[PDB]
Each structure stands twice: as C-alpha cells, then as structure tokens.
C-alpha cells in the first residue's frame, strides 16, 4: 500500500517524544471525492553525531599530545569503550564519512574525515562540549528530529509525499480525519510535478471587553468566514469565502436584550447565542474541529487572539483546548518568554496567518493596524466600535446585531487583505524555495526561513552544518524640492556584494577580513544567491513573452516576488546574531563594502550634476533637477548605467517619482507621487508620511493653517509663488486674530483627561488640568479620567503663565473680564504648526513666520554647508561665542553691572583692559582692585554652568511636541533617545557638551591677554598696550585665566585621546 499526501505543516516535541515528528496535510478520499486532513507520525529518527578525530592522541588529564597518530579505529574504540558506556548508549552504528566545515568553531579543518555515529533517539544526548583523547569535537548532538528528517529525505517545503507500508495508529494522536504511522523515515519519499490541493481557510475575528475588576479580556463575540476549497497556485476566489458562523455571548450579568432570539432569527444568519463564555469557547472549539481549517487567518492572531483564547479556555475550564490545533495535547504551551508569541505553537498543525506580519513583509504602510490596512489595501473605511460602546450594545437587539456585523465585517476585511496581498501563494513559493516549514514562513520574525536554504545547500555539498544556538546613512538633506525626485531601490545591495566579491563561509578567513582573491572559485552562498537571481531573471524573461495565459502570468509573478524576497533576505543569515550561521567577520565585510558602494554612488551622482538628498542601504533619493518626466527617466537610466559599470551585479530599479518633495526626515515628508500613465502623461497624488500630530490639543486655527501650508507646498507651483501665498495667508490670519474676526469656536482647545486632575504631578503647568480642577470645584458633574476638557487661553490681567490663564468657554462669555490671548494663539498654536512645514524651505525661518503672523521675531531667533563655508574650526571669535553668556560683575562700590566680553575696551590710545575702570563714569572704583571677588564670581559662574550641563534637560525636536524631561529613556532610535510623549521624535540636550565647552572657552577668551594682543587688538593699540602701566593688569588677567584653564584641564571634551583613535 502506498499513501500519497500533500504535507503542509510539521510538529516536533523534543522533550516529550524523542525521535517522532508529526506531518499534517491533505489526503484524497474517493469515497468522499474530497481532500481531508491527515496526520502522519514518523518515528525512529536516529540521532546522527560526527566525531572529529585528533592529529595525535592527547591525555585529557594533562592536555599534552602523546604523539601517537590517531586512526579512525582508535576513535571507534574510544567511543565504544568510554563514551558509549559512560552515557548509557547501548546500540549504535558507526561509519567513516568525509565532510567539510567552514563555520565558527576554531581548529576544525576545512575538509576532514569524521566518525558518524547513528543511534536511537530514546538513548541519552551527548554533551555539546564532549571531548576525548582521540576526538576533539562532537557535531550534531542537539540536531532536531524534524531537521534531520527534512534534510535526510530532501523535503523542501510543502509537497506530495509517498509513504510505503503505512500502518494504523493504535489510538488517535491528532484531531485529523486520517492517521498513519511510518516506522522508518526512509519510507517517506518526495513525489514531484503534481499540483497542490485546495485548502480550507478560516478568517477569524473576535470582540473582547476588558474587565475593570479582574483585569482580563473576556471574549464576547467571534465571527468566522470559511472557504473550503482555497487555491494556493491560482488566483484568490471571488467571493473569498463560502460559509460562515458567528457566536455571541452575554457579558457576565449584562443580560441580552428582550428579543435577542427573534432578531437573530430574523437576520437569517448562522448566529449561535451562548449563555456563557464557557459555552462560547466550547462552540468555537467544536466548530474549529468540524471545519478543520488548514489555514486560520487573523489580525494580531499570534499576539492577541490566540493568547486570549487560551487564557479564557483555562479560566473557564473548557475541555479539549487542543482542538484549536491538530495534535492531541494535554498540557498548554509555555508562555512566550524570549522566543515570542508566535513560537509557542498553540495551534500546532494549523498554519496561522497574521496579516500584520505578512503586511509588514509585503507592503509598506503608515501603520499596520487593521483600519490602516483596510484603507490602504482595500480602499475602504472600517468602523471601530469604542470599548465603552460594546457593553452598551446590550441594551437593544439592533445594537447587538450591529456589533456582530462589525465583527463579521472585520473577518471579511482580514480575508480580503490576505487575498489581495496573495499571502498564501507567496508563502508557499517562499517555503518551496527555502525548503522550510510553511508555519515558520508565515510566523515571521526570528523563525527559521533562509537558514533552511543554507542548510539544504551545505548538506547537499558534504558539510557539517553548525549546531542550532541554545549601515551607513547619508543623512537627509532637509528642504523643499520643486523638481522631480528619483527613488532607487538598493535592496539587492548585499546579495550583490556577496556575489561580486565571492563572500562566503569557505572563501573568507576568520578586524574586517580581507576580500577573497579572484582566483578562488565561487562559494556555496554566492552560488545560491546567483541561482536565485538567475531564476528570477528567467521567470521575468518568460513573463515578457506576449500572448501568455493570465493564470501562468500570475504564477510567474508570484514566483518572481518570492525569489526577490528570498534573495533580499539572504543577508540575515550572516548578519543577525541570533542567526544559525552568524559570522561577525563576514557581516562586517559585507557592511564595509556596502558603505564603499554607497559613498561611490554619491560621488557619481554628484559628478552628474545631480543631488543625492537621501541615502540608505535600502534606497537612494536623488534630486533630478528636471521639469520633464522623460528627462527624469533618461537620468534614471543613466544613473543605473553608471552604477552598473563599477558594479556589474548591482541591479537597481526605480521605486517611485515625486514631482515635489518637502523632506524633513526619511518617513517625514510631503510629496506629489507621480504615477505615469504612458505616453509622457502622468497623474500626481498627494502623499504625506509622518506629518500626523500626536498631540490632539490644537485649536482649529492652527490645524487649518497647517493644512493650507501643506496644500500650498503640494501644489505644482514654483517656490516663489508658494512662499508668496504662504506669506499672504499668514498675514491674513494674524490680522484676523488681532481684529477679533475669528469665530470663538476656532479658539477652543480640547484635551483628554487620562487621570483624576489632582493626580497629575505637573498639574501646575497643565492648562486642561487647571480647567478640570475648576470644574470640579464648581460643584457640577465631576470630571474624571477619560473626559475631554475644552478651554481657551484668555488674558485676565494676572501676570501668570498661559497654563494658569486657561478658562472654559462659558466662563469667557460670562465673566466679561476675560479676553482671548491672541499672542498665545499666534505664538504657541499657529506658529509651531506652520513652522514645522515651512522652516525646511530655504529662506524661511521661525523668525520670518513670526513676523508674518505679526509677532516679535526677537522671541523666536547642516555640517556639509558649514564645511563648504569654512567649517566649525575656522569661525571668527564673534561667531564662535555668540551664544555664550558674557561675564557679569557687580561693582562693590556703586553696584552697577559690568558686562565683559573682551579683554580690552575702547579704541586707540584710549584702550585699556576691561577690568581697569567701572562702566559707570561717576564711579571711580577699579574692578582690578577687587580681583578676589572677580575670582569668586568666576568660580560661581563655572559652577552654575556645570550644574546646568549636568541637569540633563532634554527637549523633543518636534515643534508640535516640545516635550521637556530630565529622564533619559533607554528606548533609542538610530538618532538618539526616543521621546516618550510622542514616540516619534528624538530628544536633544538643552545644554549639550559643546555649549559648556564653548562657554568655558569664552571665559578663557575674555581673560587671554596674549591672544587679544595678537588677534583682536590693532597695531597702534597693541603698541599702547605692550608697555608698562599695564604689567599689573597683565599679571591679574593671567591669574584669572589660570582658573578657567584649570577647569578646562579637567574637561573630557577638550582632550582627544589619539591612542583610542589610532590602534
């Protein structure tokens, strides 16, 4: 008897049953004319271990070579005598094998003969660090049974497998229709060329509610959409589902509405009413068992749905939790811990598709919440029932039916997003190319996907695979660009580097290792990357053929996408520390070569009179400087040619075109995306990335101002017209505000109360908390957390900060002593929202915007450009010290302040040291007399500045956040600490180290007699100052400079350790 079945998933339990692996899949039944789920148990997978012989026998006690050549008979004898019995190994098979090894373990020859020992999986496991007198290392001690099986039988992803001499299980082991057992793994063979079977897909959504008392999420509704024959090689079906079911429950003393049953029946749907959560979960498990989906698709299914399901099953004491999966398990899986939610295998034997992970892999979006995915992929609108409304829906049957329909619509959206992205065909192709388990392909994250490609490649070439473990950025050129902008995709950079330079585990010696010599033949990893690239090229060439079947076109498109994804992901095997194949030298070499390529590309583009306005290992953003799209395409082709000339295997593509671009940061820009319709005509679409304001307490005035500014920027007009229009609108808004023509409703600011107002530590500085406290004091409906406070900043003649002058609108209309603080509404509401978009434009600054609004610019006043104009090292003294506080000394006699900013005061023969005469003409006191006081004041000022620096105040760089905190968070982006108020901008030091260093340098400057004489002072003035009558002043100034010199000598910013730089 031969058992043919198409396998989809595998499960291994190393601790429970050694040497047994379960394969789940489809088996054709003629009695039913349909495919049914089947579980096949493969047992007796023997541990395979490789013992590495030594050159000369070594006495382990002393560690000294005995000089006796070690043949493999010696290793066999040592294993049979010492190792075999010492670890309770009874029966084993030994053999001599020739294997290669080019991985990260010292003292293992590239090619060598090993003793291969195969013994049952029930026997104990040898230590990883096992060593003997005859053998030095032991490989493969912890190899998993599933890995051994897949690599031994050459099973690469889902496929049709034939089983010879299948048996019948004594007792059911799975929740599958058919079961079979194979005693020897050699009985499973890979059939070829047959088509995949259809699969059952179940899209699942559930509504839960948080219990304020038990602090747990109670599943209150579940909706499921089922397609029983879902293709994996054809186009997604229309409609994507055939059947569906829904289950609804009451929320534990939230009784159903009077006529729930009648309404549900009238709806004429497959709705089941459960009187308890326990019954709901039992019904769900029964339905999952009966339907038996091969794929369950959800949103955040790994992280939320499955975890909540298991918690509610073990809380309500629901039997047969394992019906969620396919294997009969008694003990629930351990919590995620470090591995993650996905790597728990709650639904073992079922492929769980989380559209969050799949979307993150296959499509770029502003966010991966379900509503955003619905908006971007399906171009639809998704209605979110607020949490407080779910429990209020149990008042009317209509509301409850609406909630259930919302769950059904969410399931439909999940299935539609899965179908549109073609997640399942792509997962199948990726699994087949890599040769791993499909479940781990759809898990994502750190799950093994390309490690299996490398494992197959190395095993096919007589290698001992390693045991499983147990980037330059061209910073954005912020600004506005009215010319076409070219986006080039460099995702193929690292595979191209590996191919071109022949970087491999076998070609690089393991500081960044030197490049392999050109004489060496291609390595295994470069060969695999080349195979993938050439396969994609062949598939694309076949696709270019005209008059082709659309179905085959879709198949080839999916295959090409899978090949590209695999090729681009290959690098992760070498780069990631958790990788099975982690090789720090190889990753470092690849990164260094990538840096070189990026810098050379920048140089080329610059030589072509174009501008690289952004650059990263994944993309390049170039300023074409052209107003014609045809010339843009020509320049793109020319750039591709110039790059390919210096790097043949680096293949680049154009990822998009922008007609206009306001760029503040990668992921922070506004642009006019260009979609070319052919024949030189295109369509422009606005695209704003990263411009949303996290803070929602903004008056409508500021929101409208920002919207108008963005509209002007994203118009096809030149720069001058845009700036003129912006100035017009800002002046108009300022005049309207000052003339009181603005509707009062547009001054209202709404802010949510996330706590009781008395519980805010910073209540004094918070205006909405002030208004909430006032509201509570009045004696009406007290405002608790979750309430929205509306307020207007009003001037009342109090000389109090704007936070204290916050009033409710009714109070403003009633008191008659309250007026809207127009200055606040123009400086703190409109100006930030407008400058966050207008400041990047060259020629517009915050001061100019303030001037246009009608404010006082006085209150609002790139390294490459600095180098082009002299650099930080060639600044004049005035520019170097223009932000430094000057030395203030109060005269002991008259008490008038003296400001010192230079060593010398006056011109010509009237020039004398500053500390010689008081600034008050009527005062005859000489500060040089009270030099002890000057010394003390200098020390106090130095202490003040050091305290300011060590205060460690941080401000958010975002104008619309400007969060000020003393606490440095451990959460860092590539640019620095991530602001915890908005979670999207970097925290910058208010008083950086450079500021303190420059302040101390300035205090040294204002007492540097010699420097002032040489540089600052003129010729005649120098002559007049280089005589006697000033020697005492010179000595006192030298003493005073000694203090600042002493302080600076203790500063780490003023010293460069050349030993640390050059090594």
């Amino acid at each position: 008897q031969v058992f043919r079945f198409y396998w989809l998933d595998a499960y291994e339990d190393q601790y429970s049953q050694p040497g047994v692996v379960y394969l789940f899949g489809k088996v054709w039944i003629e009695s039913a004319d349909a495919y049914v789920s089947c579980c096949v148990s493969v047992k007796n997978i023997e541990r395979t271990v490789y013992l590495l012989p030594r050159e000369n026998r070594v006495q382990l006690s002393t560690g000294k070579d005995t000089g006796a050549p070690v043949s493999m008979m010696h290793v066999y004898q040592e294993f049979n005598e010492a190792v075999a019995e010492k670890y309770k190994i009874m029966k084993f098979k030994s053999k001599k094998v020739d294997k290669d090894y080019a991985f990260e373990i010292p003292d293992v020859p590239a090619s060598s003969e090993y003793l291969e020992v195969r013994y049952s999986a029930d026997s104990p496991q040898l230590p990883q660090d096992l060593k003997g007198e005859t053998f030095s290392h032991v490989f493969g001690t912890n190899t998993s049974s599933l890995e051994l099986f897949l690599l031994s039988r050459k099973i690469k992803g889902p496929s049709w497998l034939e089983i010879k001499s299948p048996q019948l299980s004594s007792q059911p082991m799975s929740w599958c229709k058919v079961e079979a057992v194979v005693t020897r793994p050699d009985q499973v063979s890979v059939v070829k060329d047959l088509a995949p079977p259809p699969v059952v897909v179940l899209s699942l959504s559930m509504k839960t509610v948080q219990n304020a008392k038990t602090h747990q999420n109670e599943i209150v509704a579940i909706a499921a959409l089922v397609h029983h024959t879902f293709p994996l090689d054809k186009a997604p079906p229309q409609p994507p589902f055939q059947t569906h079911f829904c289950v609804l429950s009451k929320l534990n003393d939230c009784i159903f509405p009077y006529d729930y049953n009648e309404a549900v029946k009238q709806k004429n749907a497959n709705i089941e009413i459960a009187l308890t959560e326990r019954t709901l979960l039992g019904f769900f498990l029964a339905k999952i068992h009966k339907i038996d989906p091969d794929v369950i698709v959800g949103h955040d299914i790994y992280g939320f749905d499955l975890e909540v399901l298991l918690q509610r099953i073990n809380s309500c004491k629901v039997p047969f939790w394992s019906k969620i999966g396919r294997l009969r398990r008694s003990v629930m899986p351990k919590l995620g811990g470090r591995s993650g939610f996905a790597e728990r295998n709650a639904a073992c034997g079922r492929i769980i598709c989380d559209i969050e992970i799949s979307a993150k892999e296959l499509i770029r979006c502003k966010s991966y919440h379900l509503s955003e995915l619905v908006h971007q992929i399906l171009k639809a609108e998704r209605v979110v029932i607020p949490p407080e409304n779910i429990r209020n829906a149990y008042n009317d049957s209509v509301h409850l039916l609406y909630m259930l329909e919302n769950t059904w619509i969410d399931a439909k959206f999940i299935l539609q997003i899965m179908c549109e992205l073609n997640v399942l065909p792509l997962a199948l192709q990726i699994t087949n190319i890599a040769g791993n388990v499909m479940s781990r392909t759809l898990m994502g994250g750190r799950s093994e996907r390309n490690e299996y490609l490398l494992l197959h490649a190395f095993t096919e070439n007589n290698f001992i695979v390693p045991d499983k473990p147990v980037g330059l950025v061209l910073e954005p050129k912020v600004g506005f660009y009215d010319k076409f902008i070219l986006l080039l995709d460099f995702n193929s950079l690292y595979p191209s580097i590996i191919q071109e330079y022949n970087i491999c585990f076998t070609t690089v010696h393991r500081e960044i290792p030197e490049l392999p010599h050109s004489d060496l033949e291609m390595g295994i990893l470069p060969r695999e990357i080349r195979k993938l690239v050439e396969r994609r090229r062949h598939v694309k060439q076949l696709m270019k053929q005209p008059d082709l079947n659309p179905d085959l076109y879709l198949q080839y498109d999916i295959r090409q996408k899978a090949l590209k994804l695999t090729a681009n992901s290959m690098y992760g095997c070498l780069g990631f520390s958790y990788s099975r194949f982690y090789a720090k030298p190889l990753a470092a070499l690849v990164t260094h070569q990538g840096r070189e390529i990026l810098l050379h590309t920048k140089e080329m583009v610059q030589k072509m009179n174009l501008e690289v306005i952004y650059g990263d290992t994944d993309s390049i953003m170039i300023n074409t400087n052209c107003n014609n799209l045809e010339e843009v395409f020509k320049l793109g082709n020319r750039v591709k040619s110039e790059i390919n000339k210096s790097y043949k295997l680096l293949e680049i593509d154009i990822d998009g075109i922008f007609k206009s671009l306001l760029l503040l940061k990668k992921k922070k820009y506004a642009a006019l995306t260009v979609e070319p319709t052919g024949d030189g005509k295109y369509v422009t679409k606005q695209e704003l990335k990263g411009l949303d304001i996290v803070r929602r307490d903004w008056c409508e005035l500021a929101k409208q101002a920002g919207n108008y500014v963005i509209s002007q920027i994203l118009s096809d007009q030149p720069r001058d017209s845009i700036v003129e229009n912006i100035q017009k609108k800002l002046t108009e808004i300022g005049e309207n505000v000052t003339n009181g023509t603005v509707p009062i409703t547009q001054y209202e600011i709404n802010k949510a109360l996330t706590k009781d107002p008395q519980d805010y530590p910073d209540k004094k500085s918070l205006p909405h908390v002030h208004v909430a406290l006032w509201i509570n004091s009045q004696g009406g409906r007290k405002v608790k957390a979750g309430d929205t406070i509306s307020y207007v900043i009003c001037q009342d003649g109090s000389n109090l900060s704007a936070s204290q002058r916050a009033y409710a609108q009714e109070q403003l209309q009633k008191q008659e002593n309250l007026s809207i603080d127009t200055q606040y509404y123009l400086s703190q509401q409109v100006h930030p929202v407008v400058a966050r978009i207008c400041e990047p434009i060259d020629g517009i600054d915050s001061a100019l915007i303030a001037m246009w609004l009608g404010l006082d610019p006085s209150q609002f006043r790139d390294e490459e450009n600095d180098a082009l104009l002299g650099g930080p090292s060639q600044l004049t003294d005035e520019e170097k010290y223009r932000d430094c506080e000057r030395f203030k000394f109060f005269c002991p006699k008259c008490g008038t302040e003296n400001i010192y900013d230079n060593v010398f005061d006056g011109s010509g023969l009237q020039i004398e040291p500053g500390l010689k005469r008081c600034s008050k003409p009527e005062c005859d006191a000489s500060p040089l007399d009270y030099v002890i006081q000057v010394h003390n004041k200098l020390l106090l000022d130095i202490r003040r500045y050091i305290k300011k620096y060590y205060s460690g105040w941080l401000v958010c760089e975002e104008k619309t956040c400007q969060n000020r905190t003393r606490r440095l968070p451990l959460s860092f982006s590539r640019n620095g600490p991530i602001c915890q108020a908005c979670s999207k901008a970097t925290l910058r030091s208010e008083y950086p180290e450079k500021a303190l260093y420059t302040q101390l340098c300035f205090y040294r400057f204002i007492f540097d007699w010699d420097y002032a004489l040489e540089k600052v002072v003129s010729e005649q003035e120098r002559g007049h100052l280089k005589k006697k009558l000033f020697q005492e002043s010179e000595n006192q100034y030298k003493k005073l400079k000694s203090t600042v010199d002493q302080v600076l000598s203790r500063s780490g910013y003023s010293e460069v350790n050349l030993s640390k730089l050059f090594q």
């Binding site: 602090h215 919590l335 811990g337 805010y760 910073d762 003390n936 305290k947 600490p977």
Partner: protein
C-alpha cells in the same frame, strides 16, 4: 550670639546599644588601622575628567545597572525567565525593570512607569497600575522584579513585588581579633554659623575631640558651603581656596594632641571643589610630614575599613533626596535606608535630585556598595537618628550647625567580632 550662649551643651539627644559612662575615652588612634575597603573594584582616589557625557554611555550604564541587579535577584529567587515589559501578557509573567515617573513632578501612585533593560525589553517603558498590589514602596530609579499581567498591552498590573536582597555582611579576618574597641566621632557640615565665617562650631568639635581622644574623626562636608549667605552675595575678601585651606589647617593642627585619624569627605556644596558625583577626594591641601599618616582624604561615597569594621559614609543627603520621591502603600526613613541597602548603591535615585551633578560612568564605577556596611553614616537635613536596618547601624548625626543655632554630632564604638553587635554603642550628642 545665639550659638555661644546655648545651654544644652553636651546633651545626649539619642542613644543606642550598650549603656556607657557619662564620659567617653578613646585610644588616640594607637592600635588603629584605617583603610579603604579592599574590594574587587578600585576606589576613587583622584580626579577624573568630566563634563563629557554621551547619551549612549548613560543609556548603557543604566541598562547594565538594571541587568546586573536583575541577574543577582534572578539567581537568588530562582526565577526562570524574564519577559519584555512592553509586550502584552494575558497570563502572569515576571518582569525586571526600573521605576520612574511619567512626568517631571513628584512620583505618585498614578504616575508610575516601569522601564525595562536593553536585554529583555529593548529599553521600552510601560505604565504601571498599582491597584492589585497590597503593599509596596517605590522610588524612581529602583530596580524591581514584579509578577503581573498586561491584558491590554498598554498598562502593566503588578500582582507581586519581589523584596530587595541586601548584600552579605563582611566576614572579618582574625588579624583584628585582639584589637580593642575603637571610638569614632562623626560630624557633618556646615561647620560655621549662617552669619559668620569663623568656624566656632568646628572649634568646639575640635575641643571635644582633644578632650575625648577618639580613634577616628569622620568630618563630612561642606567645609566652605556654597549656600552660605556670605558666599553667594560675594562679601568674602579672600579666595575660596584660602578659606578652605584655613579650615583644613585648623582641623588638622587642632587635632594634633588627640592623635586621631581624620577622615575628610567632600560635599557637593563645597564651593571650592569639583561639582561632580561621585566626588573625588580633596587634593588642594598637603598635610605636614607629621600628619600624613593621620589624614585620609576620601571620596564621596566612601567605604572605610577600621580594624575590620566596615563603615559606609556619604555626604549626599540621600534621605532628603529619596524622601521627596518615595511612595508607599501605608518608619519611612527605615524604608528608605533598606531601599539604599538593597539596591546596593550609594545613590540609587534616577533621575537625581536637582542639587547633585552625576557623572554616570563614575557612578557605575564607584557608587556600588561592596558589602552591607556595619555602620552607615548618612547625614541629613532631617532629624538625627540611630536606626538598625537589616543589621546595619544607620547613623544620622544631623549637621554640626543648624542655621543660627548649634547642631549635633555622633560618637560610636566599633569592635570587629563583638558578640552581630559590631556597634557596641552609639550616641547623637549636642555640640
């Protein structure tokens, strides 16, 4: 005027331990061996370049602090696995982190956040809901392990707060078994009255030292207070260094008859010294050849070994700094002292108070407590006390001068291996 006419001179305001006679006498530092506690980490004995802190370095130091304390606590409690703080948790998980306030104000039960380390949480934060915790005592910068659940993925709800684990005490060698009991007089600045710069209280204390002949005299700063009204308004006719030199000469020369080992600890309020914590020792004074072996310029904080007895001391007002931020479910000073001992740092508060400059690399290198000290000198603006916290005698002698009126000092007797009663007796006495 007020200080000179005081009537409660010599009054014993607080007592602890074995009752002693009305008069205390010492060995004049004859059979006395004073050194810095020899631990694995080298001590702070010289100035270190400062004013250059990279945010990355601060991040690394804080993360490794959390990681190291969490590793020790995990080994002690046999905790299996730590879980990322930010991730949702439907079932109970154990999470390691540090406490903080979600805003710049003072911490309260509704403003608590837990920030994880880089190893287990990628530095992510999470709000904390203390409704299900029956008993707790939390301050910012406190490394904690909690069992709790995060059902919404947005608010962590602790159900268990693991207790602190203090370091083991010191096991003295027999080398000092035959040494006699040693007398230690400890006083903290300011040493001059608010309206004078003559150091009258210091003169009285020196007279007391010469009268009683203690074996060690521990003087904690400030010695030239920065907040002194004369200093701030620039009325001094001599440089700060000169005033400090005069004060140190007075102290050292005046104690010559007593032959007492002087241990000088700097303060962040020393207007003449480097304003950075951990504070390096004073280095502007060179004792005469006849006092080199008697004067010990130590760093803030300091761990001293006196005939095997380990004395911890810090000039920083730890209790005032942490009292302003500690939140409890229901003696407050005892709780704060136990927090300091269990965190194993002489300054566990993060962010620090507004009055202390912290160099975080130096903080990592020098603040760690080697062992749990037998005596812990912690001067504070708060009231004087002698408390027994987990077997450590924490002494707050107050400050020698309290504004215009005289203050207090402390005297205690220490012998290694006594009875654990390494502190025979202790008394807070008036000047």
């Amino acid at each position: 005027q007020k200080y000179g006419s005081r009537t409660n001179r010599g009054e014993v305001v607080t007592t602890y331990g074995e009752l002693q006679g009305t008069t205390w006498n010492g060995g004049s530092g004859s059979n006395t061996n004073v050194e810095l506690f020899t631990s694995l980490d080298e001590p702070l004995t010289k100035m270190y370049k400062f004013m250059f802190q990279k945010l990355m370095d601060i991040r690394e130091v804080v993360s490794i602090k959390i990681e190291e304390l969490g590793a020790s606590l995990k080994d002690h409690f046999q905790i299996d696995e730590f879980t990322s703080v930010s991730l949702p948790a439907q079932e109970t998980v154990t999470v390691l982190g540090q406490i903080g306030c979600d805003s710049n104000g003072k911490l309260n039960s509704k403003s608590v956040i837990l920030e994880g380390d880089r190893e287990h949480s990628a530095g992510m934060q999470v709000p904390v809901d203390l409704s299900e915790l029956k008993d707790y005592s939390l301050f910012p910068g406190q490394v904690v392990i909690m069992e709790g659940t995060n059902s919404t993925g947005r608010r962590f709800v602790p159900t268990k707060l693991y207790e602190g684990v203090p370091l083991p005490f010191h096991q003295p060698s027999k080398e000092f078994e035959e040494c006699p009991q040693q007398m230690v007089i400890t006083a903290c600045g300011p040493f001059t009255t608010s309206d004078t710069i003559t150091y009258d209280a210091l003169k009285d204390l020196i007279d007391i030292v010469n009268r009683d002949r203690p074996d060690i005299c521990i003087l904690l700063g400030p010695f030239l207070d920065a907040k002194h009204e004369q200093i701030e308004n620039l009325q001094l006719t001599v440089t700060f260094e000169d005033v400090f030199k005069r004060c140190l000469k007075m102290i050292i020369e005046g104690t010559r008859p007593s032959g007492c080992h002087l241990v000088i600890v700097p303060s962040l309020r020393d207007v003449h010294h480097d304003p950075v914590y951990p504070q390096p020792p004073f280095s502007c004074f060179e004792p005469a050849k006849e006092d080199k072996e008697r004067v010990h310029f130590v760093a803030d904080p300091c761990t001293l070994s006196v005939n095997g007895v380990v004395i911890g001391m810090t000039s920083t007002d730890l209790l005032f700094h942490m009292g302003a931020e500690e939140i409890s479910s229901s003696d407050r000073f005892s709780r704060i002292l136990r927090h300091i001992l269990t965190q194993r740092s002489y300054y566990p508060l993060y962010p620090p108070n507004e009055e202390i400059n912290i160099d975080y690399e130096a903080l990592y290198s020098y603040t760690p407590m080697p062992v749990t000290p037998d005596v812990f000198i912690v001067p504070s603006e708060l009231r004087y006390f002698i408390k027994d916290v987990t077997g450590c005698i924490c002494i707050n002698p107050g400050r020698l001068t309290k504004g215009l009126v005289g203050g207090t000092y402390a005297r205690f007797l220490v012998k290694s291996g006594a009875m654990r009663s390494t502190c025979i007796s202790a008394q807070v006495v008036r000047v």
